[PDB]
Design a protein around this nucleic acid. Sequence first.
RNA 1: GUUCUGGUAAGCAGGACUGGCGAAGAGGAAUGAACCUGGCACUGUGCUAAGGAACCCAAUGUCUGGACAGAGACCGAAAGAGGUAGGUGAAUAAAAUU
Lengths: 111, 244, 198, 170, 183, 115
Amino acid sequence: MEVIKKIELKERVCAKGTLYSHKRSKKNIYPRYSLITIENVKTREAAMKYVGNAVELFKPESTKEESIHGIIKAVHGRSGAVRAKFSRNISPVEMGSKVYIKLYKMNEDEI
Amino acid sequence: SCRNYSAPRHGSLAYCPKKRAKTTKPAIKSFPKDDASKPVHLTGYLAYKVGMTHVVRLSTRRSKTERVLKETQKEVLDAVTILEVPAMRIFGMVGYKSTVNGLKAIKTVYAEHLDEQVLARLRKRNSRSSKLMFKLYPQKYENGDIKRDYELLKRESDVVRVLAHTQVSKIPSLNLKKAHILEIQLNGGTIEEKIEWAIERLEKEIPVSEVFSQQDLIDVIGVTKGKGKEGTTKRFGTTILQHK
Amino acid sequence: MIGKRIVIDAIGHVAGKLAGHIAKELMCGIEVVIVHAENVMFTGPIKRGVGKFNSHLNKSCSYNPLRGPFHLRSPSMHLMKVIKRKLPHRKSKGQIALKRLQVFDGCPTEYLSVEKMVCPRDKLEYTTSPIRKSYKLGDLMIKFGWKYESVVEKMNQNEEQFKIEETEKQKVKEQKIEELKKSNKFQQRVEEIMVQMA
Amino acid sequence: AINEYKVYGIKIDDNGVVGDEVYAHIVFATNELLAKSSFNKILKKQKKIKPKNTKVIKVEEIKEDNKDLDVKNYGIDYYYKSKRCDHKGYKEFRGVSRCHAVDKLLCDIGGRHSVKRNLIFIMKVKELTVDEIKKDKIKIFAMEDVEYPAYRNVLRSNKLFVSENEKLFN
Amino acid sequence: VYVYVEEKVQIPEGCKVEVVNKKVTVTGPKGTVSKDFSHIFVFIDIHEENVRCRLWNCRKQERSKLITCSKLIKNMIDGSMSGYFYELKAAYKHFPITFEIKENGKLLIVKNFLGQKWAREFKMIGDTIIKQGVTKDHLILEGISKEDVSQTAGLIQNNCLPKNLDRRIFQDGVYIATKGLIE
Amino acid sequence: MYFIKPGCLIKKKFSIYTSIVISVIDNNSVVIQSYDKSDNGDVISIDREVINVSKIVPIGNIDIKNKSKKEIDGILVEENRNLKNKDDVLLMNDFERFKEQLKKEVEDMVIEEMA
RNA sequence: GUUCUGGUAAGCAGGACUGGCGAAGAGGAAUGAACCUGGCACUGUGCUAAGGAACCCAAUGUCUGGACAGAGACCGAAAGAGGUAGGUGAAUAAAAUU
Ligand SMILES: [K+]
Ligand SMILES: [K+]
Ligand SMILES: [K+]
Ligand SMILES: [K+]
Ligand SMILES: [K+]
Ligand SMILES: [K+]
Ligand SMILES: [K+]
Ligand SMILES: [Mg+2]
Ligand SMILES: [Mg+2]
């Protein structure tokens, strides 16, 4: 079963993170950008080393497309969180989900 | 503005909402505190209401401070109710365990031979049955399942209760072929003693003289007479309005 | 992350401070189990706590009490309602989040073996001064009709038995292995397996 | 943080250097602009020269050495404005610089009397030996007779959740 | 703010003391007593045949608690070398009060107070025992713990007074006469 | 329990190396001589500093009844000579790390068969 | 907002000066015609204001003093004692005290 293999392949090679919010103020949301936390990264200086890296959301139960790709654009706040952009806008139903950080840089056009 | 004169409320709010009882047969829901210092005994029973009559009794009750010399004796007329109480038969037992959510039942164990009157409660319509109810259970005696069951009850329980049914066939005026079943608690001694006392008595008949004696005080639980839908004047006792 | 579970021992933490940290995790998809809810600590004298709770029982719906507030009387359920109102519970996202939480008075038998976490920033001896009073939630709730105190004392005695047995069972294996591995009979086979992997 | 500056200035009219006097003023302030502000304030109250007739010729910072961070005793004479009137007083402090002494007074009065730093005025700062000390507070620390243990616990790690069996504090 | 506060109590020749945490336990001729100081912020230890309390950098109202702690420890030591006593005396202008000792000196009954026909019953707290004095109107209490002894005596005194009568005409009562250590 | 007095040895918050107290100012501040190391190329530095007591943890005592700055630098460089920033497994190259891993992993396979 | 006249006053009646709402959206004071920031065609990337930074809810921590009252963060007078932190001026002193 290909899904079980594709997971183990990704698990061995990537860092792990979770999606927790869109970019927002107290009143309005900006769904083009999403906010991520990475496992053991806990300062803004530590987080700067990931700016530019590729990210992937893998979803095996999906009928349309099994994974969405994206890129980390900027650091956010003072405790090591980041801001990222994806080829499609993330649904509110997909918040709380697991994200993979891929250890190589890509250009803003590739996504 | 405040009302002109004071008066009490009509009826008690301790009984609201006043809805209809679900079935006609009551469970004893609360039992007196156990005491390990006494012998094993039963705490309750079932009875049927017959009717009323009156009696005359002698009395000598007066104030302790009353200065009268003579040992005055006086007749008093009193009304009384008669209840019929045929012997109940024991047919099983249940053990319970204490938890953060109250008492929960662990297992139930039944006698090897059960009566037609008690099996009749398990089906809905009396005259239409294949009667294959408890026919496979007796194997559990041969297999030692019963002996494993008693072990589990004896090992892990806080409260023990017996199951008893009433012999409806002795009271023909009821027009009833299904026995009534009640769960009754055992107080006194330790869990082991309680279980042994029960085991000795499955299938046997306990007379009312085991449980109660003359002059005792007892609590009676029942469902009242029915009166249908009714207006406020009778349901809560409110006054009738002006004639015009 | 969805699919991660965590078990928290609630003893010695200040109630309102732990609740904030827990609520954030529930919104990130973690399943949380809290154990020992009867040992959470509130600051100040118990006298003040009693008055704050009396003012709460006075609140009710004027025309129908079966709509009005429900006043919960168990340490587990009380701490549950403290966490509930630090989440967006009028909306679907909060109702989903709440169903990921379980709270127990004492420690149940299915959670004796599992390893347990703690939150140093919220422990009383870090976050408060020594010169002022405090009380336990188990001490307040006996005054407002909790009825299962003794059931929890019996549980607490089973835990102590399991702790001494597991520690005794561990220390023997530690001794056994550490005394074993110094031997020649052990150190020989290191070579015998390495001959086939070098 | 607070610094020490010395400002120099002269009078001018429709023509230059109308008086041959030069005036000076030592001040504790956070920056040069707050220093220059004080110079204007004092000139207008002790003499009557308003800014349009003044020119500042120099501003200099004053700095100590103290490479070994040696600890010294200082006494300070001050006043502050309350709701009633102006209140004078004297207090003693310990530190590694005159500025270190002065920043501790400003913090103290804000704590004890609810006053913003701009309503406090320093009159004199003096360095003192052990025989000169007047009030009770610092004398035990000056005579070198103090030891005490730690009351505050300290965290071992930056992690929010840790295993029950780990060491938690210090 | 006080820089340093220390208080000390000396352990006599026969006595033995131990400190587990903030519980302090005392043993000696008359028996054993113990008390837990976990509700006070203080550091307690045993050093060179003394019991020592200490604090640093504390407020005025914290040092009062330290001192109070030190006086309670001394009472425990004294009470262990000899117990304490309290003496009670019945007073009456018309109706003689009478006393009964029951349960080996653990229960006291009082009868005929101001002519009342109902009896009163008082129970002894802890280690305390009740005994008859020099004439029929006197009682003596004896025990190890100054707290337990004095609390008991107080409860008797506080209940055995007139109510709803003018106390400067009706002067009857049971009064605490004498108190001290036993010889 | 240890005490904060001249010659106490302390660690600072979230730090591995020892430092030493030189003078006591008030009931909450001290002057310390502090050791630290640049992981960029083993470059050490020792300097004096004023610090509040809520950031430090005491661990022991030394004499230093009378000494100069250069002497105490000597005391400090001896004291923390043995210590390190990180476990070497994270510093070494990939093949060396794998070689170290194998030792542990094989040892378990022996123990699980031998027990 | 700053000021004035009549009235015990009033979300009361009536004038003067400089900006508003009327005819004004957006972000902030939980909510509010008029208060704070600041004037609007339509898109994209960066930065700041006012106001925030345990959790609801995007971003939070540190240092030094006070304070124990179901207090305060939101909140009433003349009159006062008690507890505690500091200033100044009088004494006395065989630790200090008033
Ligand atoms: K009316
Ligand atoms: K009931
Ligand atoms: K109009
Ligand atoms: K306009
Ligand atoms: K709004
Ligand atoms: K309005
Ligand atoms: K947040
Ligand atoms: Mg009718
Ligand atoms: Mg507007």
